[PDB]
Amino acid sequence: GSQSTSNHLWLLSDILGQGATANVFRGRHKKTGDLFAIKVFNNISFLRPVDVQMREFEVLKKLNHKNIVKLFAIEEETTTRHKVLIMEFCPCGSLYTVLEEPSNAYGLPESEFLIVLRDVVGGMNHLRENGIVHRNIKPGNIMRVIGEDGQSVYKLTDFGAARELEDDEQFVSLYGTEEYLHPDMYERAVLRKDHQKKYGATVDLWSIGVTFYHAATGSLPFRPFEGPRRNKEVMYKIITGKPSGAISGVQKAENGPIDWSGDMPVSCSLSRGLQVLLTPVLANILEADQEKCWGFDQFFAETSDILH
Amino acid sequence: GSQSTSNHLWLLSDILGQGATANVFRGRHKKTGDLFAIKVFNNISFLRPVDVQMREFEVLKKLNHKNIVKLFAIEEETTTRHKVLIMEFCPCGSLYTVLEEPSNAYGLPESEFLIVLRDVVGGMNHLRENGIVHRNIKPGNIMRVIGEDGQSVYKLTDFGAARELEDDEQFVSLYGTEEYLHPDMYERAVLRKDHQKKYGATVDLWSIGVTFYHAATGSLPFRPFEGPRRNKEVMYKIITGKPSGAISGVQKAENGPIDWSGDMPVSCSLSRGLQVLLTPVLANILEADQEKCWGFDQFFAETSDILH
Numbered sequence: 001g002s003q004s005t006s007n008h009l010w011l012l013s014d015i016l017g018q019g020a021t022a023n024v025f026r027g028r029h030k031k032t033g034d035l036f037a038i039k040v041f042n043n044i045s046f047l048r049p050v051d052v053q054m055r056e057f058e059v060l061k062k063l064n065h066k067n068i069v070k071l072f073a074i075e076e077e078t079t080t081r082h083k084v085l086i087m088e089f090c091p092c093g094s095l096y097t098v099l100e101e102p103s104n105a106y107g108l109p110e111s112e113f114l115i116v117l118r119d120v121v122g123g124m125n126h127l128r129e130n131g132i133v134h135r136n137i138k139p140g141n142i143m144r145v146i147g148e149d150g151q152s153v154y155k156l157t158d159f160g161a162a163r164e165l166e167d168d169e170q171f172v173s174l175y176g177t178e179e180y181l182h183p184d185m186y187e188r189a190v191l192r193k194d195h196q197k198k199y200g201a202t203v204d205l206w207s208i209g210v211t212f213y214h215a216a217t218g219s220l221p222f223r224p225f226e227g228p229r230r231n232k233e234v235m236y237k238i239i240t241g242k243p244s245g246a247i248s249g250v251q252k253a254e255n256g257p258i259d260w261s262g263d264m265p266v267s268c269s270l271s272r273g274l275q276v277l278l279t280p281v282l283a284n285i286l287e288a289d290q291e292k293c294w295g296f297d298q299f300f301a302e303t304s305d306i307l308h
Numbered sequence: 309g310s311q312s313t314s315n316h317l318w319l320l321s322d323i324l325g326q327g328a329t330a331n332v333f334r335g336r337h338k339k340t341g342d343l344f345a346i347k348v349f350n351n352i353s354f355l356r357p358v359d360v361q362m363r364e365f366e367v368l369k370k371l372n373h374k375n376i377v378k379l380f381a382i383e384e385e386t387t388t389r390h391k392v393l394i395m396e397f398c399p400c401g402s403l404y405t406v407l408e409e410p411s412n413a414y415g416l417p418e419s420e421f422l423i424v425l426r427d428v429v430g431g432m433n434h435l436r437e438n439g440i441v442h443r444n445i446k447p448g449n450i451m452r453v454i455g456e457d458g459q460s461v462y463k464l465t466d467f468g469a470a471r472e473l474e475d476d477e478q479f480v481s482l483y484g485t486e487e488y489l490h491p492d493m494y495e496r497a498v499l500r501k502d503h504q505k506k507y508g509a510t511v512d513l514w515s516i517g518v519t520f521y522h523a524a525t526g527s528l529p530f531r532p533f534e535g536p537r538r539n540k541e542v543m544y545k546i547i548t549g550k551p552s553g554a555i556s557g558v559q560k561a562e563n564g565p566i567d568w569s570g571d572m573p574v575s576c577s578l579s580r581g582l583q584v585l586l587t588p589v590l591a592n593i594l595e596a597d598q599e600k601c602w603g604f605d606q607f608f609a610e611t612s613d614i615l616h
């Protein structure tokens with residue numbers, strides 16, 4: 001079967017994404033046949049407080065930029081009367097899928113990496129200008145679109161965890177994805193250690209740092225022997241124990257000691273010149289200590305210098 | 309983009325399911341065009357030991373039954389040379405999708421619930437006859453198919469956590485979904501409290517009990533104010549602190565006390581006669597005490613008695 005709103009229709013088997021609060025479907029405008037991605041909230045999502053439910057709607061109605069997936073319409077699905085989000089369809093899918101390809105085992109080609117850099121920075125700048133935090137940035141929700149000239153353009157999506165947050169404002173609520181998650185959030189959300197901490201916009205810089213390391217090398221920067229998901233204790237030791245300036249930490253052997261590095265791997269796909277410029281960016285955003293990590297002004301200045 | 313094996317092909321946008329280790333695509337046999345669901349493992353999945361990776365393949369090769377989604381072929385995808393699983397496509401989707409429908413907000417119609425009962429029992433019996441434990445049973449991986457006579461037939465799938473395990477064998481590894489997870493496993497996997505416990509095949513009985521409660525009432529049996537995922541500590545209190553005989557525990561108000569019940573809610577969609585037969589079944593499988601919990605045989609005997 002299918003579901004529909006006044007103007008749009010989607011088959012329930014035409015899935016594009018699956019999540020805690022919502023699924024995304026490939027759907028069509030009824031009259032034109034034009035394709036869209038339609039985000040449809042599940043029952044359990046309505047247990048959230050109303051102001052929380054409204055955030056993604058308010059956030060997306062505020063944004064408009066080439067590095068953010070476009071929102072076309074908000075309409076009401078008929079059987080539930082719930083609002084759905086009707087968004088630009090990106091037929092190429094995500095950066096996650098690009099990174100899975102064998103040719104990218106040791107990182108993206110430098111040309112493609114520089115594009116990811118440009119576009120993630122551009123998206124993040126647009127959010128910050130508009131006082132928005134994302135809180136779940138990762139390759140799985142950075143979408144690839146083929147631009148006018150045949151080259152990639154990447155765009156941020158999945159604003160399910162996003163909110164308006166003034167430049168110095170803090171929050172205590174938990175969102176995100178374990179492999180990409182700032183250590184202070186990981187501490188509470190994954191290890192359940194409550195150390196009475198607050199979090200700020202800079203959580204997005206940590207996830208971007210992890211995303212860039214991943215795009216640059218083909219691997220996540222912080223890796224217990226079993227992978228992050230399967231050894232939460234060691235994952236936490238890697239991310240909280242890392243020396244200042246380190247950008248990666250790996251446990252090579254089961255139950256083994258941890259090795260951290262402040263440089264890119266020897267296998268890194270990027271030119272050595274770029275590696276040398278990238279490494280300080282990563283070191284200063286993969287920095288848990290709020291006293292030492294970069295602010296946004298600087299992150300944008302320092303990456304915009306690399307792009308030129 | 310598409311991926312293919314010798315005999316089958318799928319578009320990467322044609323998704324049917326997404327998970328930690330794999331995605332499932334709607335694909336086709338290249339020559340006949342016949343439709344299949346194709347399970348394809350992601351890169352991070354290969355961090356698992358090889359014997360663990362092989363389990364799902366070995367398990368599915370053993371099974372052949374009306375209440376198990378059929379395995380058609382194992383073939384190699386070309387770009388990675390990884391084996392994929394080529395399965396029966398069920399165009400109707402899952403029991404989870406059925407349960408989202410507003411008409412089922414207070415539980416399935418009795419005629420449908422009885423079908424779910426017959427079929428989950430039939431699938432679970434087939435697994436036990438073959439020495440298999442599933443370890444992630446929930447509505448999301450119970451698929452609905454329309455039988456010859458127009459009536460539903462449900463079938464188990466997603467054997468990503470499954471293994472061979474005799475009644476007299478135990479394990480310490482962790483799998484499952486928090487809302488459906490046996491308390492001993494929840495304690496370690498979700499709360500990360502380690503009490504040197506070992507788990508057995510009867511973990512599938514707990515998930516089945518939660519699944520049946522959900523199908524009978526339209527709601528999960530164990531429910532903090534914010535939902536299970538948004539308040540794990542209270543969830544643990546609920547599932548471990550319930551009296552013997554209790555089949556549900558609900559926190560009504562934010563930070564409120566917990567309402568335990570050994571009976572179905574007054575809103576239950578099932579006839580009262582069926583309710584009274586169902587409740588002792590749920591009471592004796594939603595029981596962590598292994599000295600008290602039913603085994604599979606007694607569970608199949610008592611559910612068979614309801615069906616006839």
Ligand SMILES: O=C(NCCCNc1nc(Nc2cccc(NC(=O)N3CCCC3)c2)ncc1I)c1cccs1
Binds near residue numbers: 325
């Ligand atoms: O937004 C989310 N996730 C981001 C993706 C879904 N959204 C969109 N998707 C596309 N096109 C597209 C094309 C090919 C493949 C895909 N999907 C995948 O490749 N997957 C999904 C599961 C496994 C790998 C998507 N266009 C626009 C959007 I907006 C959310 C998931 C759950 C809540 S939000």
Ligand SMILES: O=C(NCCCNc1nc(Nc2cccc(NC(=O)N3CCCC3)c2)ncc1I)c1cccs1
Binds near residue numbers: 331345347451
């Ligand atoms: O097996 C899994 N999951 C079970 C489902 C995927 N498998 C199959 N699906 C179908 N048909 C089908 C039809 C309509 C919709 C759907 N999907 C959904 O409705 N979704 C998926 C995302 C949210 C809701 C599936 N037939 C056969 C199979 I095998 C796994 C997911 C990740 C690893 S394994």
